[PDB]
Paper text:
The 26S proteasome unfolds and degrades hundreds of proteins to maintain proteostasis, regulate cellular processes and generate peptides with second messenger functions. It consists of a 20S core particle (CP) capped by one or two 19S regulatory particles (RPs) that gate access to the CP proteolytic chamber. The redox-active thioredoxin (TRX)-like protein TXNL1 is expressed in many cell types and was proposed as a nearly stoichiometric component of the human 26S proteasome. It uses its C-terminal PITH (proteasome-interacting TRX) domain for binding, while potentially reducing disulfide bonds with its N-terminal TRX domain but how it binds and is regulated remained unclear.
We refer to these PSs based on the highest substrate-engaged Rpt subunit in the staircase as PSRpt1, PSRpt5, PSRpt4, PSRpt3, PSRpt6 and PSRpt2, represented by ~19,300, ~112,200, ~29,500, ~32,200, ~24,200 and ~73,100 particles, respectively. They all show typical characteristics of the substrate-engaged proteasome, with a shifted and rotated lid subcomplex, the Rpt4/Rpt5 coiled coil positioned near Rpn10, a coaxial alignment of the ATPase ring with the open-gated 20S CP and the substrate polypeptide threaded through the central channel. In PSRpt1, five subunits, Rpt1, Rpt2, Rpt6, Rpt3 and Rpt4, engage the substate and Rpt5 is the seam subunit, albeit at the top of the spiral staircase, ATP bound and ready to engage. This state, thus, immediately precedes PSRpt5. There are four subunits, Rpt5, Rpt1, Rpt2 and Rpt6, bound to ATP, while Rpt3 and Rpt4 are ADP bound. By contrast, in PS proteasomes, the PITH domain gains high affinity through additional interactions of its C-terminal tail with Rpn11’s catalytic groove and a coordination of the active-site Zn+.
Author numbering:
A (entry chain G): 6 to 244
B (entry chain C): 306 to 406
C (entry chain J): 2 to 240
D (entry chain A): 290 to 307, 314 to 433
E (entry chain K): 8 to 127, 134 to 241
F (entry chain L): 4 to 241
G (entry chain H): 3 to 234
H (entry chain M): 5 to 244
């Protein structure tokens, strides 16, 4: 099923852009997974921080970035491209606020980020960015919001999404979760993200093996739960 | 195809109306045609009909009868069979079909 | 495999695309140019009308300036575009330098127009070998022949198009100072020269003659018929 | 198929090769087994290139030493008209040169014949590269 | 590895300038002898047909009043360089009010040569012999498409260069006169020439220091040849 | 294989085959021997002649009154790089009114040379240069192979059949520092005369010497000018 | 045509620009949208079915407005839809600032199609693989145009792109009477989709817009639920 | 094959091969290591003198990006010098744009983005040099960053780039770099490097060091000649 | 093979892409313009005539370039729009610059150069659109011009392009009328030619499209006859057809 | 690999060898080693479990290996004591070891034609051109 492929601008005979297709298969080359769960008034993103060395400066091995004071993003996929996508976003929001007088809603920031990725799929100049972004933000008039922008430029509004090597089970796990409708309390949402990531991998999730981000309607600011809190949260999940 | 090996290069074109009619009469000679079975009108319904397809109308017009246990083939038995054998495939796409004005 | 580009030399120092380009000129109608003492005649054969299309939109002999006419061979699409540029060049030089263009300069420009197209890829050469004839030299008649390669050449008599080999061979052995000595004699030569027309119809020969400080004169199909007749009458001496 | 029959005949030759010296000629070396062209069997690979000019005037004199040519022939000149010509097509230029001297009953194959020879043997089959497409070179 | 001026062969060669360099061999023989008296310059016209005016075939062209040009190869390319040659020497006079040296012009034309793949085309399919007299003395300069510009006491370009050059090495020595250089060159050209040498087949042109005029030979080419 | 047509493709073994090939350009030209002493920078070039009666090719170019170079590679590229240096030094003299140091020039030559090795549209400069100049920090001898890498050399020998010239110099490197003008050059000519085939010996027509010293600008000794350095040269054993 | 399939600027030996065709394959394999022009207005429909319950159905809307009187429905690569709409709203806007009247639906498609044709004239830009249905009510007559990746804009009365399009057209030509009214038209439009949408027509699974005399508007989930309940 | 010729083409398994090859050409370079002391970072690079004729200290791999930052390119040198020049133009534009020294992290991020900028276009090839950045600042501690060809840049307590990466961490992993002041680290970085570089291969070599921290007062300049001499002696005594 | 780029010359000297392009016109609809004194007509065919297709323009194949210039199209839809867009812009520039209508032929040359220019510079696909032009001027009155994808144009007295061009062109010859080309005779022939050239018989009125150009009181009305008059036109030919059968 | 053709005789030879190889177990002093230059044509059966399974990989030598390899085949010759075998390796790439011997043997020959005893560095380089059939010509555009 290789197709004409070797060029992103040449359609396969069936109408499938193979080069764009291969983008997603590059997405899981990062070997990690991030899950975002939207609660009643919060959205929690949990990622895998597998630091394969005692020499690595653990402070800078983070997959979580702060796009803006109210919107936080996690990258799943190639670290280099994910970094560029993060950096391109920050300008896109800052241009949004500077241009219209207010902070860019998390809705568009994936749209503009998606729109940038889409033109790289038509004009055979830039090789596509091989990383999916998840934007979480407390949006006024629409509660907490989560979005996942893919290499081909498709973004959607997700009650919960996960991108990474174990996406099929992560989404199946969440799909099992969201349906038995429950009061998604901030504690419930943070717990839900941890369980989702834990069940798929089958890991204990030592305190430092993940990086959970949290955004709540009460304090609409992007925060990364400090290692003490995840342990407290993790112990809460156990009991 | 150089003269000396293939001298005459005889062309066999799809039959005309006075040729489809003749074909429809050589393969329906053994058939139990009714009265009022205008083999020409059937022929006029079959523009550019190969010539072996014309027999397909005769086998099919006769096949529409064997499912009814008869021996006589009427006109509607034909016109309903000139649509089956002489069937066509359309582009089934307006997107492609207007590519060319 | 050294023939699918314009600036790729073959192992033996050949620009094969330019060589292929002169293949179009050999596939046009025969155009003969003979320069006389006071009337530089240039003819076109294989008029080959369609019996249902007016011949005005067929013109193949065009006057580049008031003193220089240009009869081409090759492919028509490019012939119109070259003539239009040359016509603009003849006037533009006139404005830049008061004196009007000479025949040699316009040929140098035309050769300068073609050459810049064969020098670089992504641009196809003009496939026309044009016969540049004109008295504008202000005293001396002069007829040149261009080449889709880009080299302009001066001939006292020429033959371009489908039949140059036949016309040229028959032209050298019949061109002399005695022949050109007379104006009507000069035209009789070209009509005789192009009389070796693919079918020798005698009715599809179009000769145009320009004279010292004169104006171009597309011979009417009554003077040509007379000249075609007169030449026939002169040829009637065989018996 | 029986092809492997021939191949096992080469492998019985590769084993054999690797006071006995061995020669081999191949106008198309690229079709030879890489094993049989290694420097453990064919230690030396002589390339017979197209002659240079100082050799073509020598290949000519070798085949014309028995021809009935006129004393003067500018063989050096006939070497530059046969560019990229092999050591044999030089021979047919000498064989055609006489055939032009036999067609017309001259018992001395003059120089004019050779240029007529080099037009038929070399040029006549060299390339198109003709006047209309050769008025670009001067 | 021979499909652009940008690709290098494993042996280190640009297999495109060479093919351009091969394009000269399909040219016409031109000989150059530099003599203390002056520099001689001859070329085989190779008229395509009697109809063509001999003056339309430009094989020796005048760069300026002091340095002629001998060419061989693609006519269009050589013209594109010639006009690049006439202009610069005039410019060198305009901006410097002096006659440009032969080595100075041949630097100019070659500077255009070193651009086939040195911009940001194809190696010009012509090499030039530049004859002229400068402050240092009389002097002949030869250049090829590859862009090397070098000086030759006596050089021949075009087809038969190998034979002409070797036949020139034997007959040339530092102490020629202009008259003796011309005769040896014509004997060389007539020797290596395919048609019987005469007044219309070839064209000579000489540039003496004191006779910088007459950068051609018109109808006295007959007189020179008849005494061969 | 198929990865060896463009400099913009990485070979499986981690090499950029085009640069490796350009590297091969240097060995094509006639070898040049470059050696500096504590007091002078002298580089000897073995000129070549196209034909018997043709003048021999210039191998030592003039980069500035304090920086001279030897070219072993393409004729067109060597000229292009020589033009750049002179323009670079001319601005450096015009802007800072100071002699631009050889180290700064060599660094800039590499930077201009490295762009071709990374962006399609141009070919690697097939010119290997021995940059010889005298700045305020002593005489220097730099070499820039076409791969855009320049090594600070005590003495280097690039060009056809060069490895002989290198092997003589490495054998006599230690003595090079305490050299007088003539002794240093008589070494270098000895180096070039190692590269020459047994039949060929260093003649006044095929060797050009370029020496830059404490109070001396880059003087290009050729033809008779070479003789004063050539004179006194020791005969090769045979 | 075998080797000429790739480049969009090289005619095949049969005069077939294949790449445009393959792009039209991407349209013919996209979300089904249906359009019906009732004498009272224009109704458009498309199935907004997500791949799991994890999605927020209201996030991305397919049936969209351009101006107050034009809307679009697409069947093809989504993200290539958005780039189309923006050059559509801008183009619809650039008409307003210059002429000050709402852009006639004929012109918008003439220039929303001419946007498409721009990307199909050079190598290095893929064709817009999303067929578009444009509804509008201008000069008192409902309009329904289809602009294609090939650059040709039609004047459809009622059609349907996307998966199972052949069947959808057959349902039309059957239950399409040129003399309906917008109220009946919505029922027909929903039914045409019903022939392919593999599932219950949940109010967050089908998105319908009505281009009437007053202007185009993406139907709120309820009203469709009022409509869907009736049909079922 | 097929997908390995252009940097902009994704293999069906989903990776840019060109980047992988370049990162696997850095494996063919001289070993380079970096250890960050409690108040600084130390860089020690093995330099293989390829022939007795290059003067001492030539084609050096220890660069100064800015006043306080350090570079220790490991890989194809010519590509490194290019990466050095870009870094300085990035720093120089920084100091002139923001009035203070560009923080190591931001210099690595901008320099990392530039490196990743060349693995996106077919008209260019990915850089073949992976380099370590080191600096020390009273307001920012000591930071060490390794920018591999692919564009990833995250800091390391101690890292090695070159042939002996795995061999170099192993003996670096057995040091408490968190505490020892790089006064004593230089004796340790030099001691490490001699453990790597098996003599039987690669023949002769030379070692260049540099440090950033309080000891330097915030600069990166090369370790004073006196200090190195004992350091090399100190490492040499560890033959057993 | 040398059909990869529009600027590559085949060894025989043929720009294959242009042969491929102009040959591509075959797949397109048929347009014909008959000989006519005091007029000239275009007749096109609406190849796609499905039912659900709302007719909003009524002139899918006939465009009006200038106040006295009309041109049909036979080829790619996308390219047809861009050429018809460039055609009008060229004609109106001439009116602005000279305050005089663009005299027909200079309109074709302007477009033909644009079309040809594509056949010279690489990277642009040869316009696959031939288009009939009719009109009037003060210079030669009614004229007919046949544009080709390869840029070459040419005046014509009666021509057909696209589907079954051969059948139409020959018959337009077979009954070709010179001098005696009154409009009525042109209409009868034009529908008469479409009868066999158009495979589907009965030349159903809606399936044909005639636009005529006449010089009325110096106004040059360009007409697109409505279905009603076509019905009587088809009927007028239809009545004439039956009388011919009397031979038997 | 495999293929009533006339190759049903060698097929019996292979299966016979295939038979015995699995016949005897390890722990024995019958260790087997087989050499092939084309391992893409061998039967998979020949290399499965109890047959030649631990397969030895012989590479085309690297640059350092080539410098050594060109030494071993030069010991029995009077090569000059100044012959930078290392430099020779750099010029000798894509060279199979046997070809790496060809340079040595060719190097001695090239000296012979020149009437020398010790093979100079140049002689070795001329071999590196004549081992691959190349003919070194001083092309003019270099200078």
């Amino acid at each position: 099923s290789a197709g004409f492929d070797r060029h992103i601008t040449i359609f396969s005979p069936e109408g499938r852009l193979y080069q764009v297709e291969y983008a997603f298969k590059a997405i899981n080359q990062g070997g990690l997974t991030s899950v975002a769960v939207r609660g009643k008034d919060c959205a929690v993103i949990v990622t895998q921080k597998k630091v394969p060395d005692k020499l690595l400066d653990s402070s800078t091995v983070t997959h979580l970035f702060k796009i803006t004071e109210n919107i936080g993003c996690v990258m799943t996929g190639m670290t280099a491209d994910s970094r560029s996508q993060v950096q391109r976003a920050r300008y896109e929001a800052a241009n949004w606020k500077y241009k219209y007088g207010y902070e860019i809603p998390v809705d568009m920031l994936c749209k503009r980020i998606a729109d940038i990725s889409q033109v790289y799929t038509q004009n055979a100049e830039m090789r596509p960015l091989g990383c999916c972004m998840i934007l979480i933000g407390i949006d006024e008039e629409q509660g907490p919001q989560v979005y996942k922008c893919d290499p081909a430029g498709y973004y959607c509004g997700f009650k919960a999404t996960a991108a990474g090597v174990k996406q099929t089970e992560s989404t199946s796990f969440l799909e099992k979760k969201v349906k038995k409708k429950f009061d998604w309390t901030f504690e419930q949402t943070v717990e839900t993200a941890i369980t989702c990531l834990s069940t798929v991998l089958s890991i204990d999730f030592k305190p430092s093996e993940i990086e959970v981000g949290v955004v709540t309607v009460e304090n609409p600011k992007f925060r990364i739960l400090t290692e003490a809190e995840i342990d407290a949260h993790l112990v809460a999940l156990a009991e | 195809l150089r003269p000396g090996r293939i001298d005459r290069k005889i062309e066999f074109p799809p039959p005309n109306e006075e040729a489809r009619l003749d074909i429809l009469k050589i393969h329906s000679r053994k058939m139990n045609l009714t009265r009022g079975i205008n083999l020409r009108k059937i022929a006029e319904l079959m523009p550019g009909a190969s010539g072996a397809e014309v027999k397909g109308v005769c086998t099919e017009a006769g096949m529409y009868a064997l499912r009814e246990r008869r021996v006589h083939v009427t006109q509607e038995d034909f016109e309903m069979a000139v649509a089956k054998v002489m069937q066509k495939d359309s582009e089934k796409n307006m997107s492609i079909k207007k590519l060319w004005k | 495999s050294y023939d699918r580009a314009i600036t790729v030399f073959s192992p033996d120092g050949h620009l094969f695309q330019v060589e292929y380009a002169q293949e179009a000129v050999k596939k046009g109608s025969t155009a003969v140019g003979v320069r006389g003492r006071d009337i530089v005649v240039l003819g076109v054969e294989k008029k080959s009308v369609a019996k249902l299309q007016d011949e005005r939109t067929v013109r193949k002999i065009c006057a580049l300036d008031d003193n220089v006419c240009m009869a081409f061979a090759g492919l028509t699409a490019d012939a119109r575009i070259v003539i239009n540029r040359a016509r603009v060049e003849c006037q533009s030089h006139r404005l830049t330098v008061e004196d009007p263009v000479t025949v040699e300069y316009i040929t140098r420009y035309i050769a300068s127009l073609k050459q810049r197209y064969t020098q670089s890829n992504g641009r196809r050469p003009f496939g026309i070998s044009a016969l540049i004839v004109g008295f504008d030299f202000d005293g001396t008649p002069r007829l040149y022949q261009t080449d889709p390669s880009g080299t302009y050449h001066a001939w006292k008599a020429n033959a371009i198009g489908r039949g140059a080999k036949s016309v040229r061979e028959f032209l050298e052995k019949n061109y002399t100072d005695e022949a050109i000595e007379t104006d009507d004699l000069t035209i009789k030569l070209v009509i005789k020269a192009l009389l070796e027309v693919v079918q020798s119809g005698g009715k599809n020969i179009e000769l145009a003659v320009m004279r010292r400080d004169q104006s171009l004169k597309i011979l009417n199909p009554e003077e040509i018929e007379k000249y075609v007749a007169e030449i026939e009458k002169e040829k009637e001496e065989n018996e | 198929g029986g092809d492997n029959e021939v191949q096992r005949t080469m492998l019985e030759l590769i084993n054999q090769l690797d006071n006995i010296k061995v020669l081999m000629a191949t106008n198309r070396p690229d079709t030879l087994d890489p094993a049989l062209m290694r420097p453990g069997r064919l230690d030396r690979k002589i390339e017979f290139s197209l002659p240079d000019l100082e050799g073509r005037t020598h290949i000519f004199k070798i085949h014309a030493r028995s021809m009935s040519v006129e004393r003067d022939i500018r063989f050096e000149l006939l070497a530059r008209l046969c560019p990229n010509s092999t050591g044999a097509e030089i021979r047919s230029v000498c064989t055609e040169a006489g055939m032009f001297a036999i067609r017309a009953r001259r018992k001395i194959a003059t120089e004019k014949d050779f240029l007529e020879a080099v037009n038929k043997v070399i040029k006549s089959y060299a390339k198109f590269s003709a006047t209309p497409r050769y008025m670009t070179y001067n | 590895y021979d499909r652009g001026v940008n690709t290098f062969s494993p042996e280190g060669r640009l297999f495109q300038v060479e093919y351009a360099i091969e394009a000269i061999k399909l040219g016409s023989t031109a000989i150059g002898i530099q003599t203390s008296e002056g520099v001689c310059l001859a070329v085989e016209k190779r008229i395509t047909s009697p109809l063509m005016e001999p003056s339309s075939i430009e094989k020796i062209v005048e760069i300026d009043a002091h340095i002629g040009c001998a060419m061989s190869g693609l006519i269009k390319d050589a013209k594109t360089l010639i006009d690049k040659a006439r202009v610069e020497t005039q410019n060198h006079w305009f901006t410097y009010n002096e006659t440009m040296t032969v080595e100075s012009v041949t630097q100019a034309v070659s500077n255009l040569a070193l651009q086939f793949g040195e911009e940001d085309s194809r190696p010009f399919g012509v090499a030039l012999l530049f004859g002229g007299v400068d402050e240092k003395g009389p002097q002949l300069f030869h250049m090829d498409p590859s862009g090397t510009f070098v000086q030759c006491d006596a050089r021949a370009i075009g087809s038969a260069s190998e034979g002409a050059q070797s036949s020139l090495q034997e007959v040339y020595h530092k102490s020629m006169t202009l008259k003796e250089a011309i005769k040896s060159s014509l004997i060389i050209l007539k020797q290596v020439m395919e048609e019987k040498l005469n007044a219309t087949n070839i064209e000579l042109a000489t540039v003496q220091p004191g006779q910088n005029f007459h950068m051609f030979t018109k109808e006295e080419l007959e007189e020179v040849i008849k005494d061969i | 294989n198929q990865y060896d047509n463009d400099v913009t493709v990485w070979s499986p073994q981690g090499r950029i085959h085009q640069i490796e090939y350009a590297m091969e350009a240097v060995k094509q030209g006639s070898a040049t021997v470059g050696l500096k002493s504590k007091t002078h920078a002298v580089l000897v070039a073995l000129k070549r002649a196209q034909s018997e009666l043709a003048a021999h090719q210039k191998k030592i170019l003039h980069v500035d009154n304090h920086i001279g170079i030897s070219i072993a590679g393409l004729t067109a590229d060597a000229r292009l790089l020589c033009n750049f240096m002179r323009q670079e030094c001319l601005d450096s003299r015009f802007v800072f009114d100071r002699p631009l140091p050889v180290s700064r020039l060599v660094s800039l030559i590499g930077s201009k040379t490295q762009i071709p090795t990374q962006r399609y549209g141009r070919r690697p400069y097939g010119v290997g240069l021995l940059i010889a100049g005298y700045d305020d920090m002593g005489p220097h001898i730099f070499q820039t192979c076409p791969s855009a890498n320049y090594f600070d050399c005590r003495a280097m020998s690039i060009g056809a059949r060069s490895q002989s010239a290198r092997t003589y110099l490495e054998r006599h490197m230690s003595e090079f520092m305490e050299c007088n003008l003539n002794e240093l050059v008589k070494h270098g000519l000895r180096a070039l005369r190692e590269t020459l085939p047994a039949e060929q010996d260093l003649t006044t027509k095929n060797v050009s010497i370029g020496i830059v010293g404490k109070d001396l600008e880059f003087t290009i000794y050729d033809d008779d000018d070479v003789s004063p350095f050539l004179e006194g040269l020791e005969e090769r054993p045979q | 045509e075998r080797g000429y399939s790739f480049s969009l600027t090289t005619f095949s030996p049969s005069g077939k620009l294949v790449q445009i065709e393959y792009a039209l394959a991407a349209v013919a394999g996209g979300a089904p949208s249906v359009g019906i022009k009732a004498a009272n207005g224009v109704v458009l429909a498309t199935e907004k079915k997500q791949k799991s319950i994890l999605y927020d159905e209201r996030s991305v809307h397919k049936v969209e407005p351009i101006t107050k009187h034009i809307g679009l429905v697409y069947s093809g690569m989504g993200p290539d839809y958005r780039v189309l709409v923006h050059r559509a709203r801008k183009l619809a806007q650039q008409y307003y600032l210059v002429y000050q009247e709402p852009i006639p639906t004929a012109q918008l498609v003439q220039r929303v199609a001419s946007v498409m044709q721009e990307y199909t004239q050079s190598g290095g830009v893929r064709p817009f693989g999303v067929s578009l249905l444009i509804c509008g009510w201008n000069e008192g007559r409902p309009y329904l145009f289809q602009s294609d990746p090939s650059g040709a804009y039609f004047a459809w009365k009622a059609t349907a792109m996307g998966k199972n399009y052949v069947n959808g057209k057959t349902f039309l030509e059957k239950r399409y009477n040129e003399d309906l009214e917008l109220e009946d038209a919505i029922h027909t439009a929903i039914l045409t989709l019903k022939e392919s949408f593999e599932g219950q027509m949940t109010e967050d699974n089908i998105e319908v817009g009505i281009c009437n005399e007053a202007g185009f508007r993406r139907l709120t989930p309820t009203e469709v639920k009022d409509y869907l309940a009736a049909i079922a | 094959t097929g997908y390995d010729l252009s940097a902009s083409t994704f293999s069906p398994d989903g990776r840019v091969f060109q980047v992988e090859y370049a990162m696997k050409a850095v494996e063919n370079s001289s070993t380079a290591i970096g250890i960050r002391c409690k108040d600084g970072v130390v860089f020690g690079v093995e330099k293989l003198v390829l022939s007795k004729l290059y003067e001492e200290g030539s084609n050096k791999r220890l660069f100064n990006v800015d006043r306080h930052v350090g570079m220790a390119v490991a890989g194809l040198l010519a590509d490194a010098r290019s990466l050095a020049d870009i870094a300085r133009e990035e720093a120089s534009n920084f100091r002139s744009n923001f009035g203070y020294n560009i923080p190591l992290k931001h210099l690595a991020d901008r320099v990392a983005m530039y490196v990743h900028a060349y693995t996106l276009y077919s008209a260019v090839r990915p850089f073949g040099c992976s380099f370590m950045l080191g600096s020390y600042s009273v307001n920012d501690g000591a930071q060490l960053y390794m920018i591999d060809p692919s564009g990833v840049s995250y800091g390391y307590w101690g890292c090695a780039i070159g042939k002996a990466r795995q061999a170099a961490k192993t003996e670096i992993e057995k040091l408490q770099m968190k505490e020892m002041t790089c006064r004593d680290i230089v004796k340790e970085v030099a001691k490490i490097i001699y453990i790597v570089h098996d003599e039987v291969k690669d023949k002769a070599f030379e070692l260049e060091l540099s440090w950033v921290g309080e000891l330097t007062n915030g600069r990166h300049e090369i370790v004073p000649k006196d200090i190195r001499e004992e350091a090399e002696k100190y490492a040499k005594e560890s033959l057993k | 093979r040398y059909d990869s780029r529009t600027t590559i010359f085949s060894p025989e000297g043929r720009l294959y892409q242009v042969e491929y392009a102009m040959e591509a016109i075959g797949h397109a609809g048929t347009c014909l313009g008959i000989l006519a004194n005091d007029g000239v007509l275009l007749a096109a065919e609406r190849r796609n005539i499905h039912k659900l297709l709302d007719e909003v323009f009524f002139s899918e194949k006939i465009y009006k370039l200038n106040e006295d210039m009309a041109c049909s199209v036979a080829g790619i839809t996308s390219d047809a729009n861009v050429l018809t867009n460039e055609l009008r812009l060229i004609a109106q520039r001439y009116l602005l610059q000279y305050q005089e209508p663009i005299p027909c032929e200079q309109l074709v040359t302007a477009l033909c150069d644009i079309k040809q220019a594509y056949t010279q510079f690489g990277g642009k696909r040869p316009f696959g659109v031939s288009l009939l032009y009719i009109g009037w001027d003060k210079h030669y009155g009614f004229q007919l011009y046949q544009s080709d994808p390869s840029g070459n144009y040419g005046g014509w007295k009666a021509t057909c392009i696209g589907n079954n061009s051969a059948a139409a062109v020959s018959m337009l010859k077979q009954d070709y009328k010179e001098g005696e080309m009154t409009l009525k005779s042109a209409l009868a022939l034009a529908i008469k030619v479409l009868n066999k050239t158009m495979d589907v018989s009965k030349l159903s009125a809606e399936k044909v499209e005639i636009a005529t150009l006449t010089r009325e009181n110096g106004k040059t009305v360009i007409r697109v006859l409505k279905q009603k008059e076509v019905e009587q036109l088809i009927k007028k030919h239809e009545e004439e057809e039956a009388k011919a059968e009397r031979e038997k | 690999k495999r293929f009533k053709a006339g190759d049903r005789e060698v097929q019996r030879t292979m299966l016979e060898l295939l038979n015995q190889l699995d016949g005897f177990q390890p722990n024995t002093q019958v260790k087997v080693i087989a050499a092939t230059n084309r391992v893409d044509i061998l039967d998979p059966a020949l290399l499965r479990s109890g047959r030649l399974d631990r397969k030895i990989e012989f590479p085309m030598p690297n640059e350092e290996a080539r410098a050594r390899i060109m030494q071993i085949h030069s010991r029995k010759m009077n090569v000059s004591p100044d012959v930078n075998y290392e430099e020779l390796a750099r010029c000798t790439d894509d060279f199979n070891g046997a070809q790496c011997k060809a340079v040595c043997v060719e190097a001695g020959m090239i000296a012979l034609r020149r009437g020398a005893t010790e093979l100079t560095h140049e002689d070795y380089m001329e071999g590196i051109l004549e081992v691959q059939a190349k003919k070194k010509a001083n092309l003019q555009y270099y200078a």
